[PDB]
Design a protein around this ligand. Structure first.
Ligand code: CL
Ligand code: CL
Ligand code: CL
Ligand code: CL
Ligand code: CL
Ligand code: NA
Length: 129
């Protein structure tokens, strides 16, 4: 599923991401835009053999099991394929664990390089929330 901007903002708000650990909703929409272009089916392989999955590009090195990342962890206790669903619940619940692990949203490289320090409120401007 390719979300619209305001559609995704409303779904993330219903799932409790607005101001979660102090990160306003626009931060999460901005991260999703540049990580996946709002596409739940996005995948990308990393140099070390791990793979990033879904709308927030969560990494099989630490967070999910895909059966092909030897020596990795599965800290969200899910198969990585669950992060590709049109229902974003699994991705949101795993992202909550990631952002709580000490480094905040710096875990998302695209957030750090393209959203951090910008006017992220623009990403929810005009949306009915
Ligand atoms: Cl857009
Ligand atoms: Cl915001
Ligand atoms: Cl594995
Ligand atoms: Cl949902
Ligand atoms: Cl933080
Ligand atoms: Na893994």
């Amino acid at each position: 599923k390719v979300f619209g901007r305001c559609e995704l903002a409303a779904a993330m708000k219903r799932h409790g991401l607005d101001n979660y650990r102090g990160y306003s909703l626009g931060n999460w929409v901005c991260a999703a835009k540049f990580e996946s272009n709002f596409n739940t089916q996005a995948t990308n392989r990393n140099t070390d053999g791990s793979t990033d999955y879904g709308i927030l590009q969560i990494n099989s090195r630490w967070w999910c099991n895909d059966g092909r990342t030897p020596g990795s962890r599965n800290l969200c206790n899910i198969p990585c394929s669950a992060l590709l669903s049109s229902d974003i619940t699994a991705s949101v619940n795993c992202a909550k664990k990631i952002v709580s692990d000490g480094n905040g949203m710096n875990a998302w490289v695209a957030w750090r390089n393209r959203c951090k320090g910008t006017d992220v409120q623009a990403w929810i401007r005009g949306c009915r929330l």
